[PDB]
């Protein structure tokens, strides 16, 4: 009932949402807006602009000169216009002229940033502020048009690139309040967020003291509880930062009902399974994307990432040939092929494409760590160290980069020198079994057995499944034997053997050494009967394992 009324409301708004955003020649949200409408659940053109016929002629000149890449010429003709709708277009032309121009200026420059972590840019910012004061609304009014809301978006994005954070955030919120359904506005808002605790502060602000302009937006939409962008914000920031989830479950299934055919949702839904190390279900989710939407070079970088672990080289070889046929200039298509070339143990060629994939778009910092790995398999440790190190200098909060840099030193004999890198990676993702176990190995190899005991013990708690503790238990018991307290190591020896029974007789290698050692000690304890069953249960190991237990079985059998 009410859901159907909502569906009829979304279609009107999304038809409106994609109209002016494409009409104003920004494609960050225009491309996404039409995607949402296409995937919307099945249940006269609309247009309007307050422009005079005299100034409307300038719009045709301004709009057509925009997408023809002649941004500068558009500025010259559109200099004297005073309408806010056009004033945004002139400064948007100026900004994209600079943003484009900066790209050609640096192409040999791979790493982006400033080592310590304007004037031409400040010219645009002053024009925004000068025009904003002169105009006779200046937001915070019911009669606030789309353009003034859209103008604030440019002010926010131009402020962020100067690194004036906490003021662009306020500007985006003002623009978003006057006009939601601007996907590109949300993404810039999401970028300026840095930590999960900031999201909780931002999430609260969107709930108590945030309301939309009911005049501009259609009815039954301005309510925060029934909005869609606020929902889409929840699935985006809460999981890309891997933050603590709240108000996330009931929203996700609500979006799947309204958007059953939205390509973006399923791929994000597939990525959620990917992020949880659940690859088999991830493959099924992604297989629907390729069949339904065969030409989507947006999230396939994870698809070709899954296939490499799957070792489905034939399926990956199909993707490399198919993806490369579309175009070789996207960041992803130069990352899809590199995975395929890496699986064939051809590293000197795969290393080339990863550098290629990064040059096209420098924002893809995930390719640095992969570029580092292909050097280590090449037995070239010197080149790898720089490759990993650039990744952390782009953004210090990179768990992948720290770990990949820590291993490269661990491969060499410099065990202690790698302790600092692993320690730094610990603070990024403490709730991970993988990082904790490696720290224990580093402490074990540097003669710090007292510390390594507590390190492994922390790793055990973090493990989600008891099965994964088989490897840690056997090694943890050896260190106690190195500390010469045989009674203490017995309890851990019981657990590692008992996981074999809980796993319906897994009969793995590191439990074979467990039973042989346990039986040997039990002979010294004088309990031959309790040691006899241990030898028989381990009679399905290696060639030396079986004979060791067989002779032990005969010895305890005679004294039985």
């Amino acid at each position: 009932d009410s859901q159907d009324k909502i569906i009829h409301d979304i279609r009107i708004q999304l038809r409106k949402a994609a109209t002016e955003l494409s009409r104003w020649k920004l494609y960050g949200s225009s491309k996404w807006a039409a995607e949402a409408l296409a995937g919307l659940a099945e249940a006269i053109p609309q247009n309007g602009f307050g422009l005079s016929e005299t100034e409307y002629d300038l719009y045709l000149l301004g709009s057509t000169l925009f997408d023809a890449k002649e941004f500068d010429r558009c500025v010259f003709f559109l200099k004297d216009v005073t309408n806010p709708y056009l004033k945004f277009l002139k400064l948007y032309s100026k900004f994209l002229s600079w943003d484009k121009k900066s790209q050609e200026s640096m192409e040999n420059i791979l790493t982006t940033g400033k080592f310590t972590d304007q004037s031409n840019i400040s010219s645009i910012l002053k024009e925004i502020n000068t025009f904003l004061e002169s105009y006779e609304i200046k937001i915070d009014d019911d009669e606030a048009d789309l353009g003034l809301a859209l103008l604030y978006y440019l002010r926010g994005v131009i402020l962020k690139q100067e690194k004036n954070i906490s003021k662009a955030m306020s500007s985006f919120l003002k623009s978003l309040s006057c006009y939601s359904f601007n996907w590109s506005c949300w993404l810039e808002l999401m970028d300026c967020l840095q930590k999960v605790d900031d999201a909780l502060l931002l999430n609260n602000y969107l709930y108590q003291n945030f309301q939309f302009k009911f005049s501009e937006n259609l009815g039954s939409q301005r309510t925060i509880e029934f909005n869609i962008m606020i929902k889409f914000f929840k699935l985006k920031v809460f999981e890309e930062l891997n933050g603590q989830l709240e108000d996330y479950f009931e929203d996700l299934e609500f979006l799947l009902q309204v958007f059953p055919n939205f390509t973006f949702l399923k791929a994000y839904n597939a990525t959620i399974s990917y992020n949880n190390l659940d690859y088999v279900t991830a493959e099924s989710r992604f297989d629907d994307i390729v069949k339904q939407d065969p030409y989507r070079l947006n999230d396939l970088e994870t698809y070709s990432n899954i296939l490499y672990v799957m070792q489905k080289n034939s399926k990956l070889a199909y993707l490399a040939q198919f993806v490369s046929q579309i175009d070789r200039f996207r960041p992803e298509t130069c990352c899809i092929i590199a995975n395929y070339y890496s699986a064939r143990q051809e590293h000197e060629k795969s290393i080339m494409y990863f550098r290629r994939a990064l040059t096209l778009d420098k924002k893809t910092t995930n390719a640095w760590t992969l570029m580092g790995h292909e050097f280590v398999e090449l037995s070239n440790s010197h080149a790898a160290i720089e490759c990993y190190r650039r990744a952390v200098d782009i953004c210090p909060r990179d768990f992948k980069a720290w770990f990949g840099l820590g291993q490269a030193y661990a491969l060499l004999d410099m065990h202690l020198y790698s302790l600092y890198y692993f320690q730094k990676a610990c603070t990024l993702k403490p709730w991970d079994r993988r990082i904790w176990q490696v720290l224990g190995e580093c402490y074990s190899k540097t003669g710090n057995k007292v510390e390594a005991i507590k390190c492994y013990k922390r790793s055990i708690k973090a493990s989600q499944t008891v099965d994964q503790n088989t490897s840690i238990y056997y090694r943890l018991a050896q260190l106690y034997e190195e500390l010469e307290d045989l009674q203490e190591c017995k309890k851990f020896m019981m657990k590692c053997v008992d996981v074999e029974e809980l796993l319906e007789g897994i009969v793995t290698d590191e439990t074979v050494k467990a039973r042989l050692w346990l039986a040997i000690f039990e002979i010294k304890a004088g309990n031959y009967q309790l040691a006899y069953d241990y030898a028989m249960g381990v009679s399905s190991g290696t060639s030396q394992e079986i004979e060791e237990a067989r002779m032990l079985a005969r010895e305890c059998r005679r004294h039985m």
Binding site: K291, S314, A317, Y318, Q321, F322, Q325
Partner: protein
């Protein structure tokens, strides 16, 4: 009566009054619920392949294989269509998919052999055509492709024997007779070529290939 007449008429051979078959499958499509079933589209694919309408061939074959990925009734036509279009990548997918699933059936090895054939690997593809022929007799595609591997590069002497085996063991098709006559032309022997071609025209009256030859 009428629905079974149309259903049997779907499977009849082409080269003769195909417009009647078009009318019949058109009647069967909309009047009854059999609008997009397996054999009607198989007949459409066969019609397109005979008339070399390879774009519609690939379109129909894809919209049917999307439903049944291993339908052996259409796979020979699909593989021939892909060979003509030289879609190397799709052919490799199909070859791997059938290799992982149906190693015994000769369709898989015919697919692998034609994948090699599309890459100019006649000398190697000879062996895989032989394998496909052995794993399944009475298969025109495998033996005809083997004879093609023989005649394509050198070694003209026994291409005649291969085509003679094709003609004798597979009576009733004009194609082996036409090929044998063509090869007799290639060696510049004329009367025998004319005799084989008149035999082929007797077998098939309506075929551009035989009349052109």
């Amino acid at each position: 009566k009428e629905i079974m007449k149309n259903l049997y008429k779907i499977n009849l051979s082409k080269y003769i009054n195909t417009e009647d078959i078009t009318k019949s499958n058109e009647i069967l499509a909309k009047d009854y619920k059999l609008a997009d079933n397996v054999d009607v589209v198989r007949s459409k694919v066969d019609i397109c392949y005979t008339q070399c309408k390879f774009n519609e061939c690939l379109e129909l074959c894809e919209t049917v294989l999307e439903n049944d990925e291993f339908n052996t009734n259409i796979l020979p036509a699909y593989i021939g269509c892909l060979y003509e279009l030289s879609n190397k990548n799709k052919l490799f997918l199909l070859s791997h998919r059938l290799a992982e699933t149906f190693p015994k059936s000769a369709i898989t090895w015919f697919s692998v052999a034609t994948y090699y054939m599309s890459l100019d690997r006649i000398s190697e593809a000879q062996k895989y055509y032989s394998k496909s022929s052995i794993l399944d007799p009475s298969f025109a595609a495998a033996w005809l492709g083997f004879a093609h591997t023989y005649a394509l590069e050198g070694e003209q002497d026994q291409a005649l024997t291969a085509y003679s085996t094709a003609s004798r063991f597979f009576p009733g098709m004009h194609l082996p007779k036409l090929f044998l006559g063509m090869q007799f032309m290639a060696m510049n022997s004329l009367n025998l070529a004319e005799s084989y071609f008149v035999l082929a025209y007797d077998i098939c009256p309506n075929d551009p290939l035989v009349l052109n030859e």
